[PDB]
Each structure stands twice: as C-alpha cells, then as structure tokens.
Amino acid sequence: DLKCPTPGCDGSGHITGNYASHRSLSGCPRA
DNA sequence: ACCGAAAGTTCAC
DNA sequence: GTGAACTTTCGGT
C-alpha cells in the first residue's frame, strides 16, 4: 500500500533494521 | 484456520 | 551500489 495498514505505524523504520522506510506490514516499527 | 507482525531481496536512481 | 518497497511465514486468536 502507500502506507502501512497499521494506524499507529508511520512506516519510517524497521524492527530488524533491514529498511529505513516502508509502506507494508513487513516489520512495522510501531505496530 | 485466519490474521497481524516480523522479515530480507529488488527495481529504480 | 544504495534506497525505498512487499508478500511470506510465524505466532496468536
């Protein structure tokens, strides 16, 4: 999507640290 | 069984 | 090569 489906998730970050910014449920920093 | 979240390659610059 | 990006797999309900 154009942004993570998670309301509280901004998308600028990651859990493991494989991305700096994303727009999916691929390791949402703030889920 | 279904679903939210964690997870690394990939096309584009 | 680096940079922003997603569906898959796993855990949870």
CA separation for the pair A6, A10 (Å, rounded): 8
Q: What Å value separates CA A23 and C1' C4?
A: 9
Residue A4 carries which side chain, given as an amino acid letter? C
Sign (positive/negative) of CA torsion A16, A13, A11, A19? negative
Start-to-end CA distance of chain A, whole Å, equals 16
CA separation for the pair A2, A16 (Å, rounded): 21
Residue A19 CB in 7 A reach of strand B: yes
Residue A27 CB in 7 A reach of strand B: yes
Q: Contact at 8 Å (CB) between A30 and A9?
A: yes
Residue A12 CB in 7 A reach of strand C: no
* Segment holding A1, helix H or strand E: none
CA separation for the pair A6, A27 (Å, rounded): 11
Q: Contact at 8 Å (CB) between A8 and A30?
A: yes
